[PDB]
């Protein structure tokens, strides 16, 4: 709560120190950040990320703790549940490579990105304009004073009308525009981060690509490609690639160590991609001046 | 092995053969309480005199608390061994043959029931030994170098 | 070589001293003098015979990084057959010491396997290599916060 | 005489199942009790600093 009041002069605090080997001059030394005893300064940059995405007090965090704690409890149930008989999937269920790629592409990657757009324009963006929206009242407030219309008509050209002014203070209403989806591309002048209204648009844009990319493969309804067929069909004439991709369907779809290899390779790249983009295009407010973070 | 002076001699073979661990013909409860007496009264020194409170007037009562715990931990480390190295109804694993060749009784200590008796001897002796140091060293406390 | 490059280029930028990288970064002694040696002045003073600072914990971890890393070599260089002959002598000494032949290993002691040593040796090398750099990265930057 | 005096006064601590429970549970309670009720003048952490805080570089951040 204090760090919010001045992000550039209050060391974020990670936790408290209680080590009964500490002597007295250490107890003094590690007391900082405006605490009462020794503490550790948080360098994981959580403080800025939760500022941006709309959290504002301690109390939001406590329910944030409980909810995730509940989600953890739910998962532990599932790991037990799917070992008993009459709840364990058969082989053919796991080896269904088509029906899985539809859901993962359209449901997992897809809807989640659409819903995160929902949170950005129902809580986050309103937070950065002085509006405190929570589960108590989020039915009264309108994301855009004419909301839910302009989209139905077809003149979506209103949600980018009047964006945040150049002279904006991140936590209050000065210069606060009313646009929710924009395309500005610059930096927020005060906080040296990407604009909120761009990031809402981008998660909305790629919320569509995956949804439409999700209906490719055939599951039960007689339309859509067969991944076995696509591999066979791509056999170059002239023989330079031999029999081409014939038979790679079974070899992948029967070797776990193959599937894991591909997953790691793709995951290995984008993590480097994440590292390269974050430091150039700071996506969280007041994180380009916390040099250590 | 080899018979050197150290491994065999009247003085050596009388010293070892008459301390509780080797008096194979007495009850393992007492063999536990002697052992805990000598060890317990032993280590009260370094905790009290070299601990982190030696300067403070609680050096007497901070060493004793330290030694008391260490006896308790070894009591656990004793019980873990007894419960994992013997079975409740299996006989003794001690050698039953003396050097002369007389086949003597197997030691009761090397037995689940015996060892559980022995640790009862060690623990009670360990705390009793470590208080007896504290009483002497801070009541009858003149001559010592403390 | 990647994180080194990112840190030094930025640590000169944040101070507004961008000339220092652009000249020293063409010869190796520039990297050793102007980045390693120079920027670790505040870290190593985490605790000295004059006093301590907030940076002491990072100074301690810094050496702790050097220690695990240097233990890594022990498992990579010295291979198994030497240690196995060393255990056998030890497992003889324990079997002949009086008062200590009363305690018997349940699982016989052997030196680590050939693959295990490589894995263990690499575990130390990696852990020591992360902790060392992670301490220098945080302390040096946070020392100046710029 | 020492045999009989010792033999009866160490019997409760002998059954290895019970000795293991009381050692950990009782001990774990005692460790809890000693630290939660130690004097602040023998544990530096248990007392606060009670001294002014030194600001960090670049203001307080």
């Amino acid at each position: 709560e204090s760090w919010i009041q001045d992000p550039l002069h209050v060391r974020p605090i990670a936790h408290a120190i209680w080590d009964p080997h500490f002597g007295q001059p250490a107890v003094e030394a590690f007391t900082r950040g405006g605490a009462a005893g020794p503490v550790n300064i948080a360098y994981s940059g959580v403080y800025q990320w939760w500022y941006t995405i709309g959290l504002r007090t301690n109390e939001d965090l406590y329910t944030g703790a409980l909810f995730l704690l509940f989600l953890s409890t739910l998962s532990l149930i599932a790991s037990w549940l799917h070992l008993q008989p009459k709840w364990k999937p058969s082989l053919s269920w796991f080896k269904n490579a088509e029906s899985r790629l539809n859901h993962h592409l359209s449901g997992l990657f897809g809807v989640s990105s659409l819903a995160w757009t929902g949170h950005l324009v129902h809580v986050a963006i309103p937070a950065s304009r002085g509006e405190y929206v929570r589960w108590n009242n989020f039915l009264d407030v309108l994301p855009y004073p004419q909301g839910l219309g302009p989209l139905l008509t077809g003149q979506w050209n209103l949600y980018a009308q009047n964006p945040d002014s150049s002279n904006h203070l991140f936590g209050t209403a000065q210069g606060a525009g009313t646009a929710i989806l924009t395309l500005l591309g610059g930096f927020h002048p005060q906080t040296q981060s990407l604009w909120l209204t761009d990031m809402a648009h981008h998660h909305l844009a790629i919320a569509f690509i995956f949804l439409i990319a999700g209906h490719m493969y055939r599951t039960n309804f007689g339309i859509g490609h067969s991944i076995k067929d696509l591999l066979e069909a791509h056999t170059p004439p002239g023989g330079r690639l031999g029999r081409g991709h014939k038979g790679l369907y079974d070899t992948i779809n029967n070797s776990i160590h193959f599937q894991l290899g591909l997953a790691l390779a793709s995951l290995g790249v984008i993590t480097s991609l994440v590292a390269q983009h974050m430091y150039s295009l700071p996506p969280y407010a007041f994180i380009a001046q916390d040099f250590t973070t | 092995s080899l018979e050197t002076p150290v491994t065999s001699s009247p003085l050596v073979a009388w010293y070892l053969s008459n301390l509780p661990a080797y008096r194979t013909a007495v009850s393992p409860l007492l063999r536990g309480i002697e052992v805990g007496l000598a060890h317990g009264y032993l280590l009260v020194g370094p905790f009290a005199l070299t601990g982190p409170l030696r300067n403070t007037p609680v050096h007497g009562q901070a060493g004793t608390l330290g030694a008391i715990g260490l006896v308790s931990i070894l009591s656990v480390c004793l019980t873990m061994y007894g419960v994992a190295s013997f079975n409740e109804g299996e006989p003794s694993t001690a050698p039953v043959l003396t050097l002369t060749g007389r086949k003597k009784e197997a030691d009761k200590l090397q037995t689940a029931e015996g060892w559980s008796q022995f640790t009862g001897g060690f623990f009670f002796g360990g705390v009793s030994g470590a208080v007896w140091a504290y009483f002497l060293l801070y009541v009858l406390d003149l001559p010592y170098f403390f | 070589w990647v994180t080194f490059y990112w840190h030094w280029k930025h640590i000169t930028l944040w101070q507004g001293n961008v000339s220092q990288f652009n000249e020293s970064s063409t010869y190796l002694m520039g990297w050793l003098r102007d980045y390693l040696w120079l920027n670790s002045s505040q870290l190593i003073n985490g605790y000295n015979p004059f006093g301590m600072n907030s940076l002491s914990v990072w100074a301690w971890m810094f050496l702790f990084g050097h220690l695990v890393w240097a233990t890594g070599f022990m498992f990579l260089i010295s291979w198994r057959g030497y240690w196995q002959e060393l255990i056998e002598t030890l497992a003889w000494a324990h079997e002949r010491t009086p008062l200590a032949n009363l305690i018997r290993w349940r699982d016989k002691p052997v030196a680590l396997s050939i693959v295990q040593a490589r894995l263990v040796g690499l575990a130390h090398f990696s852990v020591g290599y992360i902790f060392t750099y992670a301490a220098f990265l945080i302390a040096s930057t946070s020392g100046k916060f710029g | 005489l020492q045999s009989k005096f010792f033999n009866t006064f160490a019997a409760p601590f002998t059954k290895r199942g019970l000795l293991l429970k009381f050692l950990l549970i009782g001990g774990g309670s005692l460790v809890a009790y000693v630290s939660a009720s130690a004097s602040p003048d023998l544990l530096p952490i248990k007392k606060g600093p009670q001294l002014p805080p030194t600001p960090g570089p670049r203001g307080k951040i």
Partner: peptide
């Protein structure tokens, strides 16, 4: 207050019971 109890429990007791619990399980025989 609360740290002074929970730090020892996870630092001293919870390790001890853990090590002694595994040691029996590892060294069992059936």
């Amino acid at each position: 207050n609360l740290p002074s109890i929970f730090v020892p429990l996870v630092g001293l007791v919870f390790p001890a019971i853990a090590m002694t619990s595994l040691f029996l399980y590892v060294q069992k025989k059936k």
